[PDB]
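TEACHING EXERCISE
Course module: macromolecular assemblies
Task: Read the component lines below, then compare them to the predicted structure of the full complex.
Student: A.B.
Group: 4
Components provided:
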Amino acid sequence: SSALFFGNAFIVSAIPIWLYWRIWHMDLIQSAVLYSVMTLVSTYLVAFAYKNVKFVLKHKVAQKREDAVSKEVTRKLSEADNRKMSRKEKDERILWKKNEVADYEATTFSIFYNNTLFLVLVIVASFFILKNFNPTVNYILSISASSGLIALLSTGSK
Amino acid sequence: IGFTSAPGQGGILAQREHFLDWAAFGVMTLPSIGVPLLLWYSSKRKYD
Amino acid sequence: PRKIEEIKDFLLTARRKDAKSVKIKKNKDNVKFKVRCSRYLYTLVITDKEKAEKLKQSLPPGKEL
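Instructor-supplied answer key:
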């Protein structure tokens, strides 16, 4: 799970580089290091944001899965095995599997929410703020601001 | 000596990774469009 | 109040629907975990710091004094 989270964070932080790869194509032999370092720092910040958001939303997700918990209760109990089962282990196993699926769905939702928020302000920034500043500096600052806001929306400790 | 100088600048982004450029840029991210909807539909079918 | 003697009993208590909060009190000698339930406040006393941290890690998903 840690490895897949690592890879997902890196790929979602690198896909902006994927769309910025051939769109301008300025000195790749020298801009590759800049792209790598920005991707790494964005990956770290977005991973911190993902951890914070999943931790804060797990409280709601606990009761969000209650209907599915009861649905699995129905099947785990509607059997002659449940007539002479442990009568408690069933609850433990269904809680474990529902927690696992809840964590998976919550992480997916958070990752894609941050990804969707990533490509909202960057386009308008590159379209407008280039009037007075260098386009490359504008793209760099837009990416930095997007990463910072993605990190800050997690905790929100204003 | 006559030459008509105009400040006309236009942007054409990468055709492959305006219309084609922006369309390709928008359709680049496939999972973000389907996977959340896939999870929503899975939850709906598990609840409905 | 009620005093719980076992870790498993405390974990069962903390998972009850009526449980509202758990508060951790770091004393010089020991540590106390207190669960606020409907009728009684349940206290578990742990003398081992490592065991205290391990128990703190394994708590239901849903404050320190």
